[PDB]
Symmetry: C2
Subunit: 80 residues, 2 copies
């Protein structure tokens, strides 16, 4: 039942400035730990550097809030 | 291991305007559900009515964020 933990990931990520939705989220248990990969939407007119900053902020916010996550890979794609 | 869920309760409650710490928190599992009681600190010069409003806001915020909670009793005491 991954719904609860994935809902928490999505909520945490959406609250980070510059996130235009969670496009993709894959999470899996590795023992009691979560390993996850996610794609966030960002403003197509943000720079590549800004998108990298948003990704890093999402990684921090999500790992900060969901303590069981032991790996979180975040990438960005243009949305709207 | 109640630490993770109790940390989440405390954090959620502290982010509600007017909460001056969590004085007490007791949480227990009733099957897969959490039942909890908590005491929040509030400004001694808030009115009784305001303290009741803060308690209700904490109940909403905490239940909103921690979906496994199926009962949450919140009371208030003067702090500082």
């Amino acid at each position: 039942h991954m719904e609860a933990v994935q809902n928490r990931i999505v909520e945490a990520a959406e609250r980070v400035p510059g996130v235009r939705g969670v496009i993709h989220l894959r999470a899996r248990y590795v023992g009691q730990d979560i390993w996850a990969e996610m794609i966030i939407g960002v403003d197509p007119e943000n720079t590549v550097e800004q998108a990298h900053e948003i990704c890093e902020a999402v990684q921090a916010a999500v790992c900060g809030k969901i303590r069981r996550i032991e790996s979180l890979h975040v990438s960005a794609e243009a949305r709207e």
